[PDB]
Amino acid sequence: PFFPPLYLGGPEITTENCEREPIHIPGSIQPHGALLTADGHSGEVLQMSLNAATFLGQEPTVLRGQTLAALLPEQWPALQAALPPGCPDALQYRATLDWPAAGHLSLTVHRVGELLILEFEPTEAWDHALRNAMSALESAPNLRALAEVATQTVRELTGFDRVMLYKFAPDATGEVIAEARREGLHAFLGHRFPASLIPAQARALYTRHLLRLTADTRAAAVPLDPVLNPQTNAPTPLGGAVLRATSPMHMQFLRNMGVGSSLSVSVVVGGQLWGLIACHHQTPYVLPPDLRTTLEYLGRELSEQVQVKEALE
Ligand SMILES: *C/C=C1/C(=C/c2[nH]c(/C=C3[NH+]=C(/C=C4\NC(=O)C(C=C)=C4C)C(C)=C\3CCC(=O)O)c(CCC(=O)O)c2C)NC(=O)[C@H]1C
């Protein structure tokens, strides 16, 4: 079972207890976006990432306690309709806000219990691609070809320096079984790794929340304020928030591997984590929301295609 998070006096994680880190409730986010939580009935803004002004242009003391009716008058009625209390946690509301001065902000919202979790990120245009990518996966005649096509297709869509298919064995060790990578980079094909490098609670989370990333492996996490949800005096669930701060153990692993940006998408087969599409860039690199949506759709397709193929064998 999970340790309490650090801000509730839980132990700091070492290689003796990798699996006990409550990675879903870090109480902090990555600084390339901003996050608010709001009461799912009143729309009262309950928590804000400390960088909320970088993205929203508001007075911090003014942000907290303001309602979404006042802050986002156009979107609030849409949110009430799209994410009513009792709706599935998997539902997402997305909108583009045109009012920010630097450029458009992309808003992603999901509900966890009585909380709306609002994620704000800069908009960025990105180059039919999804349909062709899906067809490429479907056209692969066997699992080996499917792995090859998946890595190639994801690399083409993203421009990541390295895209791997990381496959789990029954003992939860992992192996890179397919790869597409930048010219002149060493291969990771055939490399095998202990189960602890993607520990059991991470693998469980990844069976439910299918994409996660670290946009900048040297960027300090930005606290939520207050860190505890005022509704509960308990941690805010961030497992479904792409902006969730990454485990420091994993941040360090990535930096030691020469990785500046990391992203993976789950391959889930029979409710089990079959593997990951695991991506690296050597520098920081922020993929925009619409491209992440494309990758999520491809992960679901890859999962379905692995499942169909393994069934027919
Ligand atoms: C003692 C704890 C440690 C630890 C825990 C840990 N690891 C993750 C997440 C990931 N680890 C990954 C591992 C690899 N990526 C690679 O490219 C390779 C080999 C080529 C390996 C072995 C991967 C892919 C992930 C998924 C996240 C991502 O794609 O970037 C977590 C959870 C991270 C999070 O979601 O917050 C944790 C807690 N890692 C260790 O190495 C040991 C020391």
Residue numbers in the entry: 7 to 133, 138 to 323
Sentences reproduced from the published study:
Bacteriophytochromes (BphPs) are promising design templates for NIR fluorescent proteins. Their covalent association with the linear tetrapyrrole biliverdin IXα (BV) allows BphPs to absorb light in the red and far-red region of the spectrum. To increase BphP utility as a fluorophore, residues in this GAF dimer interface have been rationally mutated to create a monomer.
Our motivation in this study has been to explore the effects of a nonpolar substitution of residue 207, which is in closest proximity to the four nitrogen atoms of BV and the ordered pyrrole water found interacting with three of them. To gain insight into the fluorescent nature of WiPhy2, a 1.3 Å resolution crystal structure was obtained. There were no significant changes to the overall structure of WiPhy2 compared to DrCBDmon (RMSD 0.82 Å over all 296 shared Cα atoms including mobile loop regions). The BV chromophore is well-ordered with no evidence of a break in electron density for the cysteine connection to the A-ring. For D207L, within 5 Å of any Leu atom there are only four waters, including the pyrrole water with strong interactions to BV nitrogen atoms in A-, B-, and C-rings. We demonstrate that WiPhy2 has a fluorescence quantum yield of nearly 9% and an excited state lifetime of 780 ps, both ~20% higher than WiPhy, representing the effect of the Leu on the excited state decay of BV in the binding pocket. Indeed, in WiPhy2 Leu at position 207 raises fluorescence quantum yield and lengthens excited state lifetime, maintaining an illumination wavelength of nearly 700 nm while avoiding PPIXα binding or a narrow pH window for efficacy.
